[PDB]
Design a binder for this molecule. Structure first.
Ligand SMILES: CO[C@H]1/C=C/O[C@@]2(C)Oc3c(C)c(O)c4c(O)c(c(/C=N/N5CCN(C6CCCC6)CC5)c(O)c4c3C2=O)NC(=O)/C(C)=C\C=C\[C@H](C)[C@H](O)[C@@H](C)[C@@H](O)[C@@H](C)[C@H](OC(C)=O)[C@@H]1C
Ligand SMILES: [Mg+2]
Ligand SMILES: [Mg+2]
Ligand SMILES: [Mg+2]
Ligand SMILES: [Mg+2]
Ligand SMILES: [Mg+2]
Ligand SMILES: [Mg+2]
Ligand SMILES: [Mg+2]
Ligand SMILES: [Mg+2]
Ligand SMILES: [Mg+2]
Ligand SMILES: [Mg+2]
Ligand SMILES: [Mg+2]
Ligand SMILES: [Mg+2]
Ligand SMILES: [Mg+2]
Ligand SMILES: [Mg+2]
Ligand SMILES: [Mg+2]
Ligand SMILES: [Mg+2]
Ligand SMILES: [Mg+2]
Ligand SMILES: [Mg+2]
Ligand SMILES: [Mg+2]
Ligand SMILES: [Mg+2]
Ligand SMILES: [Mg+2]
Ligand SMILES: [Mg+2]
Ligand SMILES: [Mg+2]
Ligand SMILES: [Mg+2]
Ligand SMILES: [Mg+2]
Ligand SMILES: [Mg+2]
Ligand SMILES: [Mg+2]
Ligand SMILES: [Mg+2]
Ligand SMILES: [Mg+2]
Ligand SMILES: [Mg+2]
Ligand SMILES: [Mg+2]
Ligand SMILES: [Mg+2]
Ligand SMILES: [Mg+2]
Ligand SMILES: [Mg+2]
Ligand SMILES: [Mg+2]
Ligand SMILES: [Mg+2]
Ligand SMILES: [Mg+2]
Ligand SMILES: [Mg+2]
Ligand SMILES: [Mg+2]
Ligand SMILES: [Mg+2]
Ligand SMILES: [Mg+2]
Ligand SMILES: [Mg+2]
Ligand SMILES: [Mg+2]
Ligand SMILES: [Mg+2]
Ligand SMILES: [Mg+2]
Ligand SMILES: [Mg+2]
Ligand SMILES: [Mg+2]
Ligand SMILES: [Mg+2]
Ligand SMILES: [Mg+2]
Ligand SMILES: [Mg+2]
Ligand SMILES: [Mg+2]
Ligand SMILES: [Mg+2]
Ligand SMILES: [Mg+2]
Ligand SMILES: [Mg+2]
Ligand SMILES: [Mg+2]
Ligand SMILES: [Mg+2]
Ligand SMILES: [Mg+2]
Ligand SMILES: [Mg+2]
Ligand SMILES: [Mg+2]
Ligand SMILES: [Mg+2]
Ligand SMILES: [Mg+2]
Ligand SMILES: [Mg+2]
Ligand SMILES: [Mg+2]
Ligand SMILES: [Mg+2]
Ligand SMILES: [Mg+2]
Ligand SMILES: [Mg+2]
Ligand SMILES: [Mg+2]
Ligand SMILES: [Mg+2]
Ligand SMILES: [Mg+2]
Ligand SMILES: [Mg+2]
Ligand SMILES: [Mg+2]
Ligand SMILES: [Mg+2]
Ligand SMILES: [Mg+2]
Ligand SMILES: [Mg+2]
Ligand SMILES: [Mg+2]
Ligand SMILES: [Mg+2]
Ligand SMILES: [Mg+2]
Ligand SMILES: [Mg+2]
Ligand SMILES: [Mg+2]
Ligand SMILES: [Mg+2]
Ligand SMILES: [Mg+2]
Ligand SMILES: [Mg+2]
Ligand SMILES: [Mg+2]
Ligand SMILES: [Mg+2]
Ligand SMILES: [Mg+2]
Ligand SMILES: [Mg+2]
Ligand SMILES: [Mg+2]
Ligand SMILES: [Mg+2]
Ligand SMILES: [Mg+2]
Ligand SMILES: [Mg+2]
Ligand SMILES: [Mg+2]
Ligand SMILES: [Mg+2]
Ligand SMILES: [Mg+2]
Ligand SMILES: [Mg+2]
Ligand SMILES: [Mg+2]
Ligand SMILES: [Mg+2]
Ligand SMILES: [Mg+2]
Ligand SMILES: [Mg+2]
Ligand SMILES: [Mg+2]
Ligand SMILES: [Mg+2]
Ligand SMILES: [Mg+2]
Ligand SMILES: [Mg+2]
Ligand SMILES: [Mg+2]
Ligand SMILES: [Mg+2]
Ligand SMILES: [Mg+2]
Ligand SMILES: [Mg+2]
Ligand SMILES: [Mg+2]
Ligand SMILES: [Zn+2]
Lengths: 113, 283, 112, 52, 1119, 164, 12
């Protein structure tokens, strides 16, 4: 952009990029088996209460993962959001089998409603 | 997991799979219905085939068709594609095709819907107009704020009641110049939104106070011609109306033009003396 | 009355297939021309999916709002306009089951 | 301010034997400059009929 | 007025008959004007011969021989105008002579069978399919031949391609992948490029040595010797290679197919294919395509040359064998004739298909007429092409020019088989060869760009669709007046130069003078200049050629100017530019605007409806004049007589002017004096300020006509009567409803007045219980009918000028089923200029009127004459069309000098010549000023002061002298008008031509409060009278999302469009001055949940604590 | 075979109709006006009959069909809706019911409710309309209350502007 | 795979 005249504050790109890293990988399990890619803060949730409130330090060892903005969204918490762009068909199938409770946060999912 | 197997097929509502009268007497029905019949007939013929007596080959043969059918309504094309008889080799829209589709449900659920209190006309520069307001064709305002006007007609002598106030305006030649005075009064402090062709950023929609004006064109302020990428060679802008006292509150508080002067991209102003102003101020 | 705070997709129990349903569509009878009315029990029947007129009933024993929540003695029609006719669900009872292609042919066969 | 051709009903008509069209003529009339001498004459109707 | 034209490049040849493409194509297409004796046998006659000899021999009994004699079509069912008054498709009747043979003694000849009513062409070049005049647009694609293109992913070597169109008909490719395989593919799978040569008779030894001695690749050819040692057996072996599990024995059957008849095209034996051959590769042809069936032993003079050139292309320079696809000598243009002839033969096949079945059905010999022919196919086929072909379009008559161009457009998209939607950028770019063959400015500024474009000035489709362009010959340093229409390909073999080259006649004048070999700019010597450009005009299209100083205008905006003309609306007052290019005359003439005199004579009568002229030959003919006709796009087309009574006419002189002609010259918009400065904000980005004065004179005014229509339908509830009876409320509205039912001609109709009345029945099947009581209370006996009456749709109407009613006993008209009767209402309206309108010069400056100023205070010149329009300067630097600023300067001269000029494309006027006329104008301007009695103002001097401090005038000279300088610069002093003070600094002004653009239906500013709703989707929908809601797209959603506009978005998703129960309570609330309610659930949501439910899934909304909640208010619980 | 059921007779009927149209296409060169078809068919065949039969013969259309430039046009968005009270109507029913309800009260709850309930509550019987009191008192109060009601409503013009 | 052939084969 700079090279093209546009002057946009870094902030914005940051917000985006961050979301390309909302997920990581697993190598030392506790609740769900190792090879799984899940939301970074959602693990900071597990590790936090698993070492602080409930004892037995079962360290949840992860590995920072980088995935493309397309994929970052392609797979997320809310299936509602996922039903939209990826495979309306798969997105649901899985969300169903698992009995997914879409907590509405985020504007795309809560708009459909 | 014992539910993935199907033995009870939910059927979609009826008015959602219409049967309608057209022209001459043509009819029109949701493709879903030809698929339902498929299943029903097969399911029935199955029953009667079991009851009549049952030669294995034929029972399976049917069971097979049956299966295929159960696919059809759910999702067509995953395994072969069902067709209405010779006329259109077209995949009868499967329920699936409804949800996803080239232009399906969640999909068009986000492409758009049509607002009830909307309008659109050609735009034209409004040099005297202040950022605050915008020129809106009274003729347009009328349809737009129709109900708001109706009642206001009743609060004044112009009409006895709504239905009256309605017929009073159903024809153009019947409007007393008192009605304009009513509308101009209804619009006192209300404001509307204006949109531009590609809505690219939040300023792609801005709120202003309407100042009713003659004719067809919509008077837009020059300073905001930069937020919306609008030039005057036929660019047309839509216009919407904030109905709730809340929608209006936000609309004029945090969505009106003269309040969002600096861009979200850069702390640089977007309300800058564009072309003609500089040229003047510079010389 | 309470704000909708969470949506959830879950699998359909056959008993729930029937819980949502009304009647069983048992015949391929759309609508018969002479009277553009629903043919027999078929896809459009009024018992299965609902009445096709405002506050009024099919035959007309009860016709206004005073008794808005009751059903007709000789024929079944509880009312508020035909929207009920577009929201209601009917079901077909399959002879020998079959399975959802949505679960059998997704790349990972959820049943395989 | 106004014109009445006897057989013509709308402005977009054409009169036989008349090269010009109603609209061209009503146009030519706008070109016409008259002068009355006193207030008593607010609206004067001028008449003309010619044949062949 | 006088005319002065500046540039001198001797225009050696007149421009060709602009519609020759459309006229001649349909001429050769259908050679019907001439006996079957005449030789041109392409098209119809060709397509006929192509499928006529139907040989049906054995499966039971056969020996069928149906043979074609002569094709004859002659007496039109009805005539042109009748075809437009009545819904009719002007088509000529055709029945050719046919005679079926027999294996038993007897040949029955059933002379005629009229199958297929084929449309005819108007003398202008347009058609008349159904009510509206239509046009067949030409197309482009890979001309059927054979080329060699670089291989896909492997950088290595390139592969061969044999292109045979029709679709059915193989598509070959030759590729060598040396580890052990060669690949030749027809439908898909591969095999060795030799088993075939063996079949034909080429043996390993003779082949390898003569063809590839110079080509070591010969080794891959003699490789699998085991099979190469058995000839005719190779024929069966390849049969075997194909795959079904077929009988080894089939003597010479499949070999035939890739042999003589079908699959390889049955085009012309000598050019439609053999051209692409002898020049590109190989030499001869022994029958159209690789063909023979005489001895069972086939001959292939094509199969070996293709490989011959592959071994050649791969090994050096026999020549440089690389084919640039986009070369026009590769890309062919389909003239109308071909487009119709193809659909005509497709039908012939459909016909011939059904007839074969009837060679078996008819009992004995009397089977000639009905037993073999059924007109159902040909009709449907051809008919489908003129009415549903994505090619045959509505005529573009917003004014003659617009239509004419729409008759000479070349499009990409179409048949679906040729270039479709996918591919683009390589095609879309202006290819090198596009010179004189396609404009580089003409294509549509929009998504579909570069794929649709009209040809150039002297561009002509020769024998087969190859736009040739005229280039004159120059032998040595000598230039000729002789011209060669050269194919795209041949153009590259020569060194060609531009017309701008100083010429003394036949003598080139400068040593180092420009030329361009092959798409490359090259400074060549007078001794190398083989050929020269024919004209500057031939480089572009007609539409473009109309621009004054194209030379000084950015090609980008020049496009705008060219498409703007296409949107020119006919004003009751036409005007030719003060400065013209030179083709205005030829445009009106070649288009069919004005009516010209056939031969010399005198004029008899000059009606307003007819000019009966008397030729000196002793004859006189009456020439009707389309008084006021309805153009497809609603622009007036009237022919206004310009000749007085008893006048000796020269052959080919304008008797009457076309819709938009002043004096036999193209005229649109109207030259208006214009100042070019900024005003308040009235002209800010692209806004235009206009002087009220322009409306005082009926200057920008134009007549429109919308043809409202209503039908009396037959409902099972009772016929919809059309009667003056309008059931519920007033006679006031019935006035203009003079005739019982219809509206009276000449009546001023405003929006909401009844155009026509009609009465249908109230309910679907049953009456109304509640409406039963009301009627009874004030008047039980109440006409139980419904007002369904054609009304004036919001927007506008004028005065009714014509009406048409077709009742029960139809004359010769086509009334659709259910359709009891129809009622047309032609309305006309004067469209005087107003603020909403958009006007734009030929250069591209486009823009809208933002304010109409009182002559009182707009910019006025020293002598009291004021400016009509004030254009903003700013719109000129960014965009790059100085040509407009050049026009305004010549214009100023033409104003005072009272004269119009003609500035050719690039040869036209020059900066010094204009300064010269400006000099002459200063004397008319200021000379009279000297004599009339006065000198210079305080103001005039003041602005001079600020002007010398600027640098526009030589300090020290006298004001009189200074003003001349300043005037020669094109600008003069102007006073405000509002203040009377001057506008510090000279400002230019002058006669700029400006047109007014047609107002589309969208223009009719929509605005909808409440209205209909789709049946399945519950979102707002319009149509006839309710405007239909605007779309709230995602991009717009986000816009609000960004803002804290929560409710405002909710509303947009609920109350405004889908909340069924929402919108209703919404209105009512508003009505009762109630602060609108809080949204119920959207039907989009519910529609979803159930759609979702329709599939196994269960979607249940939940509570605070995971518990139910209810969206479907009370309708889902059971019973 | 069809969505809209058609008994065996109509079927053969349609085959006969078709077959006949075939023999008629044989020579005219004119797709038979429904005159020929009647004739050629037999005993009681007329134009109304044939236009009717071929109208039933047309199978339906896909309510969802690719329309115009089939890019993404599904036929069913263009059909309006009839039972649904477009805003205009909901407003109607409000004032109408509120004012009709105001008049119904200030009146004798006798012959007004009789005709109000007989006409606006069940089905459309002067005699069978009133309880015990015969016809004379029905017409008596019906026409005297109905007119006092209309003529005072003429004064305070509320109803005049025909809600319909 | 494709349904006709299989049954044809099936009873044939
Ligand atoms: C064969 O009939 C149809 C086939 C469709 O199928 C499909 C898939 O195949 C197509 C072709 C094979 C084409 O060759 C084609 C065009 O050549 C074309 C446009 C479209 N041009 N529009 C685009 C919108 N703008 C507008 C300006 C303000 C913004 C919006 C105006 C120009 C277009 O989409 C085309 C198209 C298709 O879509 N046009 C131009 O070249 C042009 C730049 C200007 C011409 C304007 C005339 C006014 C116009 O000709 C008019 C007389 C009608 O003829 C048409 C509308 C016609 O409709 C009927 C009915 O007859 C269709 C072409
Ligand atoms: Mg720069
Ligand atoms: Mg992170
Ligand atoms: Mg712990
Ligand atoms: Mg532990
Ligand atoms: Mg994401
Ligand atoms: Mg995913
Ligand atoms: Mg999937
Ligand atoms: Mg319809
Ligand atoms: Mg079927
Ligand atoms: Mg049994
Ligand atoms: Mg079908
Ligand atoms: Mg699909
Ligand atoms: Mg002010
Ligand atoms: Mg203003
Ligand atoms: Mg007005
Ligand atoms: Mg209105
Ligand atoms: Mg009135
Ligand atoms: Mg007044
Ligand atoms: Mg504009
Ligand atoms: Mg335009
Ligand atoms: Mg727009
Ligand atoms: Mg910022
Ligand atoms: Mg709730
Ligand atoms: Mg169960
Ligand atoms: Mg059911
Ligand atoms: Mg009972
Ligand atoms: Mg009961
Ligand atoms: Mg009973
Ligand atoms: Mg996969
Ligand atoms: Mg008279
Ligand atoms: Mg006097
Ligand atoms: Mg006097
Ligand atoms: Mg006096
Ligand atoms: Mg006075
Ligand atoms: Mg007097
Ligand atoms: Mg007088
Ligand atoms: Mg007289
Ligand atoms: Mg010439
Ligand atoms: Mg010449
Ligand atoms: Mg003859
Ligand atoms: Mg003979
Ligand atoms: Mg002619
Ligand atoms: Mg017509
Ligand atoms: Mg590849
Ligand atoms: Mg092929
Ligand atoms: Mg040799
Ligand atoms: Mg090899
Ligand atoms: Mg040669
Ligand atoms: Mg050959
Ligand atoms: Mg040979
Ligand atoms: Mg065939
Ligand atoms: Mg015979
Ligand atoms: Mg692709
Ligand atoms: Mg270009
Ligand atoms: Mg585009
Ligand atoms: Mg695109
Ligand atoms: Mg040709
Ligand atoms: Mg050249
Ligand atoms: Mg040389
Ligand atoms: Mg021009
Ligand atoms: Mg000349
Ligand atoms: Mg004569
Ligand atoms: Mg003659
Ligand atoms: Mg005439
Ligand atoms: Mg004479
Ligand atoms: Mg003369
Ligand atoms: Mg005048
Ligand atoms: Mg004029
Ligand atoms: Mg009367
Ligand atoms: Mg009604
Ligand atoms: Mg009825
Ligand atoms: Mg009905
Ligand atoms: Mg009567
Ligand atoms: Mg009415
Ligand atoms: Mg309209
Ligand atoms: Mg009018
Ligand atoms: Mg008759
Ligand atoms: Mg007819
Ligand atoms: Mg008729
Ligand atoms: Mg007409
Ligand atoms: Mg207007
Ligand atoms: Mg003058
Ligand atoms: Mg002069
Ligand atoms: Mg001079
Ligand atoms: Mg001098
Ligand atoms: Mg348009
Ligand atoms: Mg409405
Ligand atoms: Mg509307
Ligand atoms: Mg909600
Ligand atoms: Mg659930
Ligand atoms: Mg019978
Ligand atoms: Mg039959
Ligand atoms: Mg007859
Ligand atoms: Mg049938
Ligand atoms: Mg689609
Ligand atoms: Mg009372
Ligand atoms: Mg009382
Ligand atoms: Mg009482
Ligand atoms: Mg009382
Ligand atoms: Mg009662
Ligand atoms: Mg009632
Ligand atoms: Mg009763
Ligand atoms: Mg009774
Ligand atoms: Mg009784
Ligand atoms: Mg009595
Ligand atoms: Mg009152
Ligand atoms: Mg398989
Ligand atoms: Zn009932």
């Amino acid at each position: 952009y700079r090279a093209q005249g546009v002057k946009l504050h870094d902030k914005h790109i940051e917000i985006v990029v961050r979301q390309m890293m909302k997920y990581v990988e697993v190598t030392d399990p506790g609740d769900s088996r190792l090879l799984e890619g899940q939301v970074l803060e959602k693990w900071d949730v597990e590790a936090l209460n698993e070492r602080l409130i409930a004892e037995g330090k079962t360290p949840v060892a992860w590995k920072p993962l980088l995935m493309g903005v397309t994929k970052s969204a392609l797979s997320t918490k809310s299936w509602l959001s996922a039903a939209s762009f990826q495979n309306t068909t798969h997105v649901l199938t899985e969300a169903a089998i698992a009995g997914k409770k879409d907590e509405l946060i985020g504007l795309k999912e809560n708009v459909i409603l | 997991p014992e539910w993935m197997i199907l033995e009870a097929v939910p059927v979609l509502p009826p008015d959602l799979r219409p049967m309608v009268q057209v022209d001459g007497g043509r009819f029109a029905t949701s493709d879903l219905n030809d698929l339902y019949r498929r299943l029903i007939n097969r399911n029935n013929r199955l029953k009667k085939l079991l009851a009549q007596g049952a030669p294995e080959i034929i029972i399976r043969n049917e069971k097979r068709m049956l299966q295929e059918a159960v696919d059809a309504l759910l999702d067509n094309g995953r395994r072969g594609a069902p067709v209405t008889n010779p006329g259109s080799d077209r995949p009868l829209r499967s329920l699936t095709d409804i949800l996803s589709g080239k232009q399906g449900r969640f999909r068009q659920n986000l492409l758009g819907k049509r607002v009830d209190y909307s309008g659109r006309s050609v735009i034209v520069v409004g040099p005297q107009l202040k950022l605050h307001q915008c020129g809106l064709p009274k003729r347009m305002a009328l349809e737009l704020f129709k109900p708001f006007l109706l009642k206001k007609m009743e609060e004044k002598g112009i009409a006895p009641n709504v239905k009256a106030a309605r017929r009073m305006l159903e024809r153009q030649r019947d409007i007393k110049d008192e009605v304009w005075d009513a509308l101009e009064e209804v619009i006192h402090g209300k404001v509307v939104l204006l949109n531009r062709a590609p809505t690219l950023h939040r300023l792609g929609i801005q709120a202003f106070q309407p100042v009713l004006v003659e004719g067809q064109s919509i008077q837009l302020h020059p300073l905001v011609c930069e937020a919306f990428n609008a030039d005057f060679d036929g660019d047309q802008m839509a216009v919407h109306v904030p109905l709730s006292s809340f929608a209006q509150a936000e609309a004029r508080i945090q969505m009106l033009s003269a309040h969002n002067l600096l861009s979200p991209a850069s702390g640089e102003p977007l309300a800058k003396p564009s072309r003609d102003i500089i040229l003047g101020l510079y010389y | 009355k309470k704000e909708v705070r969470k949506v959830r997709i879950a699998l359909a129990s056959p008993e729930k297939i029937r819980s949502w349903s009304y009647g069983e569509v048992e015949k391929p009878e759309t609508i018969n021309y002479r009277t553009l009315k629903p043919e027999r029990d078929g896809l459009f029947d009024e018992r299965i999916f609902g009445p096709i007129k405002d506050y009024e009933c099919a035959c007309g024993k009860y016709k206004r709002q005073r008794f808005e929540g009751k059903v007709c003695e000789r024929c079944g029609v509880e009312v508020t306009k035909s929207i009920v006719r577009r929201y209601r669900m009917g079901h077909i009872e399959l002879a020998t089951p079959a399975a959802h292609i949505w679960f059998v042919k997704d790349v990972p066969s959820k049943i395989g | 301010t106004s014109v009445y051709i006897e057989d013509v009903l709308h402005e977009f008509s054409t009169i036989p034997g008349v090269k010009e069209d109603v609209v061209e003529i009503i146009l030519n009339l706008k070109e016409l400059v008259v002068r009355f001498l006193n207030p008593s004459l607010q609206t004067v109707t001028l008449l003309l009929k010619a044949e062949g | 007025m006088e005319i002065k034209r500046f540039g001198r490049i001797r225009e050696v040849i007149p421009l060709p008959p602009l519609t020759e493409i459309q006229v001649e194509s349909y001429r050769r297409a259908l050679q019907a004007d001439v006996p079957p004796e005449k030789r041109e046998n392409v098209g119809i006659q060709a397509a006929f011969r192509e499928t006529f000899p139907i040989e049906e021999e054995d499966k039971g009994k056969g020996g069928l021989v149906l043979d074609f004699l002569e094709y004859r079509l002659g007496e039109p069912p009805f005539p042109q105008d009748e075809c437009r008054e009545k819904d009719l498709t002007y088509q000529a009747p055709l029945y050719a002579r046919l005679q079926l043979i027999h294996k038993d003694t007897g040949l029955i000849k059933e002379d005629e069978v009229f199958l297929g009513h084929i449309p005819l062409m108007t003398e202008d070049g347009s058609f008349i399919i159904n009510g509206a005049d239509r046009v067949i647009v030409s197309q482009i694609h890979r001309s059927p031949g054979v080329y060699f293109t670089p291989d896909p992913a492997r950088p290595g070597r390139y592969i061969a391609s044999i292109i045979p169109l029709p679709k059915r008909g193989p598509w070959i490719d030759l590729e060598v992948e040396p580890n052990g395989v060669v690949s030749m593919k027809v439908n898909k799978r591969k095999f060795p490029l030799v088993l075939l040569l063996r079949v034909l008779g080429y043996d390993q030894e003779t082949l390898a040595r003569e063809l590839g001695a110079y080509g070591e690749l010969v080794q891959g050819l003699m490789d699998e010797s085991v099979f190469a040692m058995r000839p005719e057996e190779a024929l069966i072996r390849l049969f075997t290679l194909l795959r079904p599990g077929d009988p080894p024995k089939r003597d010479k059957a499949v070999a035939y197919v890739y042999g003589l008849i079908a699959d390889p095209r049955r085009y012309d034996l000598g050019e439609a294919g053999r051209y692409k051959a002898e020049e590109k590769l190989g030499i001869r042809l022994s029958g159209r395509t690789l063909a023979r069936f005489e001895d069972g032993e086939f001959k292939d003079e094509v199969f070996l040359p293709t490989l011959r050139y592959l071994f050649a292309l791969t090994a050096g320079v026999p020549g440089h064998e690389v084919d640039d696809i986009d070369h026009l000598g590769n890309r062919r243009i389909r003239t109308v004739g071909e487009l119709m002839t193809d659909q005509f033969r497709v039908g012939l096949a459909r016909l011939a298909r059904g007839v074969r079945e009837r060679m078996l059905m008819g009992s004995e010999d009397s089977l000639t007429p009905a037993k073999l022919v059924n007109s159902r196919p040909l009709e449907a086929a051809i008919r489908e092409f003129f009415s549903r072909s994505q090619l045959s379009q509505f005529k573009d008559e917003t004014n003659p020019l617009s239509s004419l161009r729409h008759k000479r457009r070349i499009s990409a998209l179409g048949p679906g088989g040729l270039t479709r939607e996918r591919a683009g950028f390589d095609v879309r770019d202006v290819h090198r060869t596009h010179y004189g063959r396609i404009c580089p400015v003409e294509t549509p500024e929009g998504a579909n760009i570069g794929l649709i474009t009209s040809l150039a000035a002297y561009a002509r489709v020769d024998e087969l669709g190859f736009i040739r362009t005229p280039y004159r010959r120059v032998v040595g340093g000598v230039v000729t007046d002789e011209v060669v229409y050269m194919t795209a390909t041949e153009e590259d073999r020569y060194t060609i130069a531009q017309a701008n080259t100083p010429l003394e006649g036949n003598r080139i004048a400068a040593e180092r003078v420009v030329a361009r070999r092959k798409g490359e700019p090259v400074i060549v010597s007078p001794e190398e200049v083989e050929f020269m450009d024919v004209s500057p005009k031939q480089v572009f299209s007609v539409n473009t050629n109309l621009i004054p100083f194209l030379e000084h205008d950015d090609a980008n905006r020049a496009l705008m100017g060219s498409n703007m003309q296409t949107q020119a609306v006919p004003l009751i007052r036409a005007q030719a530019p003060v400065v013209m290019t030179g083709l205005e005359e030829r445009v009106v003439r070649d288009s069919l605007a004005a009516l010209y005199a056939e031969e010399d004579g005198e004029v008899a009568k000059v009606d307003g409806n007819r000019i009966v002229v008397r030729y000196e030959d002793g004859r006189l003919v009456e020439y009707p004049l389309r008084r006021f006709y309805r153009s497809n796009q609603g622009t007036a087309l009237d022919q206004r007589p310009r000749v007085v009574v008893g006048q000796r006419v020269r052959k080919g002189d304008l008797l009457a002017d076309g819709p938009a002609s002043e004096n036999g010259f193209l005229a649109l918009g109207q030259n208006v004096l214009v100042a070019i400065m900024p005003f308040d904000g009235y002209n800010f980005e692209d806004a235009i300020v206009i002087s009220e004065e322009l409306l005082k004179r009926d200057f920008y005014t134009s007549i429109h006509i919308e043809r409202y229509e209503i039908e009396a339908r037959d409902t099972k509830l009772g016929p919809e009567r059309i009667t003056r009876d309008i059931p519920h409320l007033s006679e006031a509205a019935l006035r203009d409803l003079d005739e019982e039912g219809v509206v009276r001609i000449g009546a001023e109709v405003k929006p909401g007045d009844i155009l026509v009345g009609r009465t249908s029945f109230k309910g679907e099947s049953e009456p109304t219980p509640e409406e039963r009581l009301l009627r009874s209370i004030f008047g039980e006996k109440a006409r139980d009918v419904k007002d369904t009456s054609l009304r004036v749709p919001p927007g506008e109407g004028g005065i009714v000028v014509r009406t048409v009613r077709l009742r029960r006993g139809d004359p010769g008209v086509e009334l659709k089923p259910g359709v009891r009767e129809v009622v047309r209402v032609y309305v006309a309206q004067k469209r005087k200029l107003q603020v909403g309108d958009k006007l734009a010069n030929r250069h591209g400056n486009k823009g809208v009127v933002a304010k109409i100023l009182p002559v009182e205070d707009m910019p006025h010149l020293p002598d009291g004459t004021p400016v009509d329009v004030i254009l903003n300067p700013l719109g000129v630097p960014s965009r790059m069309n100085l040509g407009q600023i050049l026009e305004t300067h010549l214009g100023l001269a033409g104003y005072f000098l009272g004269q119009r000029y003609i500035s050719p494309i690039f040869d036209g006027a020059k900066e010094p010549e204009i300064k010269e006329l400006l000099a002459q104008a200063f004397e008319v301007y200021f000379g009279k000023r000297k004599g009339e009695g006065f000198g210079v103002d305080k103001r005039e001097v003041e602005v001079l002061r600020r002007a010398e401090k600027l640098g526009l005038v030589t300090p020290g000279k006298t004001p009189e002298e200074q003003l001349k300088e300043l005037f020669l610069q094109g600008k003069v002093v102007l006073y405000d008008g509002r203040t009377g003070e001057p506008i510090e600094g000279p400002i230019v002004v002058g006669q700029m031509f400006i047109m007014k653009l047609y107002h589309m239906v969208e223009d009719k500013m929509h605005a909808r409060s409440t209205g209909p709703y789709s049946l399945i989707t519950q979102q707002p929908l319009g149509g006839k009278a309710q405007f239909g809601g605007q779309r709230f797209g995602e991009m717009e959603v986000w816009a609000l999302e960004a803002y804290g506009a929560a409710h405002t978005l909710q509303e947009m998703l609920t109350l405004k469009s889908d909340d069924i129960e929402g919108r209703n309570a919404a209105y009512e609330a508003i009505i009762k001055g109630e602060d609108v309610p809080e949204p119920s659930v959207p039907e989009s949501f519910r529609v979803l949940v159930k759609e979702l439910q329709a599939l196994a899934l269960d979607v249940q909304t939940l509570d605070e604590k995971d518990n139910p909640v209810d969206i479907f208010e009370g309708l889902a619980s059971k019973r | 075979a069809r969505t809209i059921r058609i008994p065996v007779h109509m079927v053969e009927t349609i085959n006969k109709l078709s077959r006949t149209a075939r023999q008629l296409q044989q020579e005219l060169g004119r797709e038979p006006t429904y005159e020929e078809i009647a004739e050629a068919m037999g005993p009681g065949w007329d134009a109304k009959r044939v236009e009717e039969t071929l109208k039933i013969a047309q199978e339906p259309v896909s309510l969802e069909t690719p329309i115009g430039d089939e890019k993404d046009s599904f036929y069913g968005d263009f059909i309006p809706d009839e039972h649904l009270p477009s805003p205009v109507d909901a407003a109607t029913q409000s004032l109408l019911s509120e004012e009709l309800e105001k008049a119904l009260s200030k009146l004798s709850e006798r012959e007004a409710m009789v005709l109000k309930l007989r006409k606006g509550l069940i089905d459309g019987e002067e005699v069978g309309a009133f309880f015990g009191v015969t016809r004379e008192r029905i017409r008596q109060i019906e026409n005297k209350a109905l007119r006092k009601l209309k003529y005072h409503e003429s004064r305070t013009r509320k109803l005049r502007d025909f809600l319909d | 795979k494709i349904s006709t052939s299989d049954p044809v084969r099936q009873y044939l």
